[PDB]
Design an enzyme around this catalytic site. Structure first.
Site, PDB file in Angstrom:
ATOM      1  N   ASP A 290       0.857  -1.139  -0.099  1.00  0.00           N
ATOM      2  CA  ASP A 290      -0.090   0.064  -0.098  1.00  0.00           C
ATOM      3  C   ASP A 290       0.927   1.116  -0.001  1.00  0.00           C
ATOM      4  O   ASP A 290       1.880   1.441   0.767  1.00  0.00           O
ATOM      5  CB  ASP A 290      -0.899  -0.040   1.256  1.00  0.00           C
ATOM      6  CG  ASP A 290      -1.856   1.208   1.405  1.00  0.00           C
ATOM      7  OD1 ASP A 290      -2.677   1.596   0.562  1.00  0.00           O
ATOM      8  OD2 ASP A 290      -1.541   2.081   2.574  1.00  0.00           O
ATOM      9  N   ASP A 292       1.228   5.243   0.754  1.00  0.00           N
ATOM     10  CA  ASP A 292       0.587   6.218   1.254  1.00  0.00           C
ATOM     11  C   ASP A 292       1.335   7.434   1.063  1.00  0.00           C
ATOM     12  O   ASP A 292       1.952   7.918   2.119  1.00  0.00           O
ATOM     13  CB  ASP A 292       0.121   6.046   2.617  1.00  0.00           C
ATOM     14  CG  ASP A 292      -0.978   5.133   2.876  1.00  0.00           C
ATOM     15  OD1 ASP A 292      -1.315   4.238   1.890  1.00  0.00           O
ATOM     16  OD2 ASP A 292      -1.343   4.641   4.290  1.00  0.00           O
ATOM     17  N   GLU A 294       1.691  10.871   0.738  1.00  0.00           N
ATOM     18  CA  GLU A 294       0.892  12.449   1.264  1.00  0.00           C
ATOM     19  C   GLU A 294       1.663  13.446   1.347  1.00  0.00           C
ATOM     20  O   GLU A 294       2.682  13.925   1.864  1.00  0.00           O
ATOM     21  CB  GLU A 294       0.618  12.038   2.788  1.00  0.00           C
ATOM     22  CG  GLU A 294      -0.168  10.884   3.042  1.00  0.00           C
ATOM     23  CD  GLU A 294      -0.781  10.692   4.334  1.00  0.00           C
ATOM     24  OE1 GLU A 294      -1.126  11.786   4.947  1.00  0.00           O
ATOM     25  OE2 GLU A 294      -1.303   9.531   4.738  1.00  0.00           O
ATOM     26  N   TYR A 370     -11.167  11.844   5.812  1.00  0.00           N
ATOM     27  CA  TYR A 370     -11.140  12.381   7.273  1.00  0.00           C
ATOM     28  C   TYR A 370     -10.047  13.393   7.159  1.00  0.00           C
ATOM     29  O   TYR A 370      -9.448  13.750   6.125  1.00  0.00           O
ATOM     30  CB  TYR A 370     -10.592  11.257   8.156  1.00  0.00           C
ATOM     31  CG  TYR A 370      -9.850  10.072   7.653  1.00  0.00           C
ATOM     32  CD1 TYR A 370      -8.217  10.495   7.496  1.00  0.00           C
ATOM     33  CD2 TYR A 370     -10.322   8.550   7.647  1.00  0.00           C
ATOM     34  CE1 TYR A 370      -7.552   9.528   7.108  1.00  0.00           C
ATOM     35  CE2 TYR A 370      -9.393   7.741   7.330  1.00  0.00           C
ATOM     36  CZ  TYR A 370      -7.918   8.288   6.794  1.00  0.00           C
ATOM     37  OH  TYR A 370      -7.112   7.266   6.444  1.00  0.00           O
TER      38      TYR A 370
HETATM   39  S1  LIG Z   1       1.550  11.765  12.959  1.00  0.00           S
HETATM   40  C1  LIG Z   1       0.891  12.612  11.937  1.00  0.00           C
HETATM   41  N1  LIG Z   1      -0.467  12.668  11.911  1.00  0.00           N
HETATM   42  C2  LIG Z   1      -1.088  13.602  10.951  1.00  0.00           C
HETATM   43  C3  LIG Z   1      -1.895  12.952  10.057  1.00  0.00           C
HETATM   44  C4  LIG Z   1      -2.450  13.625   9.245  1.00  0.00           C
HETATM   45  C5  LIG Z   1      -2.374  15.096   9.261  1.00  0.00           C
HETATM   46  O1  LIG Z   1      -2.977  16.157   8.525  1.00  0.00           O
HETATM   47  C6  LIG Z   1      -2.707  17.273   9.280  1.00  0.00           C
HETATM   48  C7  LIG Z   1      -2.827  18.459   8.608  1.00  0.00           C
HETATM   49  N2  LIG Z   1      -2.040  19.548   9.010  1.00  0.00           N
HETATM   50  C8  LIG Z   1      -2.548  20.497   8.252  1.00  0.00           C
HETATM   51  C9  LIG Z   1      -3.555  20.161   7.295  1.00  0.00           C
HETATM   52  N3  LIG Z   1      -3.862  18.538   7.727  1.00  0.00           N
HETATM   53  C10 LIG Z   1      -1.836  16.845  10.018  1.00  0.00           C
HETATM   54  C11 LIG Z   1      -1.767  15.555  10.314  1.00  0.00           C
HETATM   55  C12 LIG Z   1      -1.133  14.780  11.216  1.00  0.00           C
END
Ligand SMILES: S=C=Nc1ccc2oc(C3=NCCN3)cc2c1
Ligand SMILES: S=C=Nc1ccc2oc(C3=NCCN3)cc2c1
Length: 575
Positions: A290, A292, A294, A370
């Protein structure tokens, strides 16, 4: 006949052999800790002190001959190679022209990383996870995190495995640029530097070999001398229990995506793809890969990375190349391997990949429905809603409106349906999309009633900062709380609110909240009602099913609701 071989148990490693050598009391480079052999080297010493020794020995496993060789006097070492892990009743016989005589049988263990030597794992699952008979075509996925065995105290035998089709194991790093990992603090970056000592950049490694394969779990019957231990030996024993379960390593994630931005150069993809083939030959319990990343185009943890022009073509090439690699493994093994990816679903993430081209190579896309809103700023909203909430302004939902200062919205609002529809409209098949459900909340404090523009809707307020709390409350980092913490500290058993929180639900968005008007603590999450609405939506659109992040944070309610909302449904699996 010759004197019967007497097997020297302590001279033959008490008959414990392993196709994998794992360093156990040290932490070093991955290629110094992990060595895998296609055939185990079996060496068994035996003696014949009285009588005649004979000329030739034969080794039997479960009554079938597996090796033969010459007797050397009073003491002989039977050496041979063997490919198939398992537990076998071994006998050694000595022969000459006069006849043959055989040792008593003794059990030999040949460990391998499919768990073929292991009994089904003994489970210890919270009995609030209920039983269902969801159709087997439907994906019911979740993420198990390697570090969940520490403070979160959630181990492999805690997962409600009969209620899962896919376990994504979070997360396998890529050696190379990884400054984002410093944002977790602690030892994570330095552990990665150790793992990557002597490893080429752009190859995968195990981040935490203590959690992966060194730590002895007494519930799995591990001994300090057991050859494979940790989460990985438990997943092997889980796959013996539930052979149709798919266990897939997840590469990357929020903190471990920085190397993917160099995959615009094919040479780095080639390095990566070869390492992943090796990884899956080493660790046979895994069923695919998988990805991921990001995210293609940026907007992830690294503010200085992301190429909107080039990352999409890179992502597609990667998938093309990984699928060629996985096809080689299917030819070699006769197994089926899956290729999946978790993706962002904001319009500005989806516009950076031509998914109509990528998805031809892929079994599933885990749509990250999410983290739409959160404590990184002080704007409330629904983090995991299907549709647009009441709080949104005119024309915010489709992006044609203007904001409170008069500035154009740049695209449709962050909701699950806006991202699923953008994916569908470009030709991604519904039956490859898996809808995400959250086993956690995000939240704020300081959203007091005086800040609301609509007094009925705390999502129209303004925060002063992130939710704060303790790890006993499920708050492992500010602004994020486990669902089982929301249930124990804010909802209560009857779901009507405790500790000064009140429950509310946006029936247009399909999104719950809990709000303490005194502290202004406001938390957006998924609950039974919103997860039934996600299941009904998935059935309505013919999506592949549901997945969740992260399984340790549920108390059974969210996974139960995933199943309940899917009742009656079937779907066509992708070919
Ligand atoms: S460990 C890590 N965990 C995570 C997992 C996903 C996430 O998205 C954000 C986020 N910050 C600004 C817009 N989105 C922070 C963030 C931390
Ligand atoms: S050792 C001990 N505790 C640990 C060890 C490793 C870890 O990784 C994280 C992490 N948080 C968000 C993404 N990864 C937390 C964490 C805690």
């Amino acid at each position: 006949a010759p004197t019967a071989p007497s097997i020297d148990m302590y001279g033959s490693n008490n008959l414990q052999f392993s196709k994998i050598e794992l360093a156990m009391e040290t932490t070093s480079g991955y290629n110094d800790m992990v060595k895998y052999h296609e055939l185990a080297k079996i060496k068994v010493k035996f003696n014949q002190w009285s009588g005649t020794s004979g000329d030739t020995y034969n080794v039997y496993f479960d009554g079938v001959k597996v090796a033969t060789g010459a007797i050397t006097g009073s003491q002989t070492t039977a050496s041979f190679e063997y490919g198939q892990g398992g537990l076998y009743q071994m006998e050694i016989e000595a022969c000459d022209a006069t006849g043959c005589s055989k040792s008593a049988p003794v059990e030999i263990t040949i460990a391998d990383t499919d768990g073929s030597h292991l009994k089904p794992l003994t489970m210890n699952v919270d009995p609030n996870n209920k039983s269902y008979n969801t159709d087997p075509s439907i994906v019911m996925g979740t993420y198990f995190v390697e570090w969940g065995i520490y403070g979160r105290d959630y181990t492999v035998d805690n997962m409600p495995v009969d209620n899962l089709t896919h376990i994504l194991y979070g997360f396998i790093p890529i050696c190379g640029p990884n400054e984002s990992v410093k944002s977790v603090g602690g030892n994570s970056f330095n552990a990665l530097q150790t793992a990557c000592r002597g490893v080429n950049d752009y190859e995968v490694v195990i981040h935490d070999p203590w959690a992966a394969y060194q730590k002895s779990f007494p519930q799995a019957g591990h001994e300090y001398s057991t050859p494979i231990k940790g989460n990985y030996a438990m997943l092997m024993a889980l796959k013996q229990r539930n052979p149709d379960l798919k266990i897939i390593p997840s590469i990357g994630g929020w903190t471990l995506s920085d190397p993917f931005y160099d995959f615009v150069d094919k040479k780095n993809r080639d390095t990566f793809v070869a390492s992943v083939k090796k990884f899956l030959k080493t660790w046979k319990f895994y069923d695919g890969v998988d990805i991921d990343w990001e995210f293609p185009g940026g907007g992830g943890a690294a503010a200085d990375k992301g190429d909107p022009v080039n990352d999409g073509p890179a992502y597609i090439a990667l998938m093309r190349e990984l699928r060629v690699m996985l096809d080689e493994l299917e030819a070699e093994t006769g197994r089926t391997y899956e290729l999946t990816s978790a993706i962002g679903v904001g319009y500005d993430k989806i516009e950076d990949v031509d998914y109509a081209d990528a998805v031809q190579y892929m079994d599933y896309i885990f749509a990250m429905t999410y983290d739409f809103y959160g404590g990184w700023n002080n704007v409330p909203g629904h983090q995991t809603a299907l549709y647009c909430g009441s709080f949104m302004r005119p024309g915010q939902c489709d992006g044609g409106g203007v904001d409170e200062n008069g500035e154009p919205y740049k695209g449709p609002a962050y909701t699950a349906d806006n991202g699923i529809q953008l994916l569908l409209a470009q030709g991604v098949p519904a039956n490859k999309l898996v809808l995400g459900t959250a086993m956690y909340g995000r939240g704020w404090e300081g959203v007091t009633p005086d800040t609301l523009t609509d007094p009925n809707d705390p999502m129209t307020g303004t925060a002063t900062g992130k939710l704060k709390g303790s790890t006993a409350q499920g708050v492992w980092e500010d602004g994020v709380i486990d669902y089982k913490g929301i249930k124990s500290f804010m909802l209560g058993a009857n779901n009507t609110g405790i500790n000064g929180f009140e429950y509310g639900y946006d029936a247009q968005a399909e999104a719950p909240w809990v709000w303490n008007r005194s502290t202004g603590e406001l938390i957006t999450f998924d609950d039974h009602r919103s997860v039934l609405a996600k299941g009904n939506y998935a059935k309505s659109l013919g999506l592949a099913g549901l997945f969740s992040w992260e399984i340790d944070a549920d108390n059974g309610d969210i996974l139960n609701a995933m199943h309940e909302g899917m009742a009656g449904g079937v779907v066509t699996p992708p070919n």
